[PDB]
């Protein structure tokens, strides 16, 4: 074994938020949608087991898991927050996952809707053969 391999994949993290016309009963003022995907519709399912979106404690059932695309959550509330996103790979070893602190921000009323995209590069050094294969079918 001399041959070394480095694999990169691109994730995208992003979200939409817009002002409701009529606030909800809880006084939710905004509707929003956060998600994770690969670019140009790449099958990230090949190497992603699951994604967990950690909503703020103010949310009931805050820890939201998607095992299958689309990796997203659609919700209503009243303010933005730091939104930890855990992406879990189909990997027998390190890294088993990765954490991002996703700035889920809203805009005030009178301002345009949020439409935010955060591109993220992951690098893997000398994954197993199995994981290298899933990574690269993606």
């Amino acid at each position: 074994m001399a041959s070394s391999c480095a694999v990169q994949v691109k994730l995208e993290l992003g979200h939409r938020a817009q002002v409701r016309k009529k606030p909800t009963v809880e006084g939710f003022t905004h509707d929003w949608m956060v998600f994770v995907r690969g670019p140009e519709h790449s099958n990230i399912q090949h190497f992603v087991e699951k994604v967990v979106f950690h909503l703020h404690e103010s949310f009931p059932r805050p820890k939201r898991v998607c095992k299958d695309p689309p990796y997203k959550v659609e919700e209503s509330g009243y303010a933005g927050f730091i939104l930890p996103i855990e992406v879990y790979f189909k990997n027998k070893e390190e890294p088993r996952k990765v954490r991002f602190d996703y700035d889920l921000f809203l805009h005030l009323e009178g301002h345009p809707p949020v439409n935010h995209l955060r591109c993220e590069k992951l690098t893997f050094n000398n994954p197993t053969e199995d994981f290298r294969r899933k990574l690269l079918k993606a």
Partner: peptide, 4 residues
């Protein structure tokens, strides 16, 4: 607006 942000939630602590």
């Amino acid at each position: 607006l942000t939630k602590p």
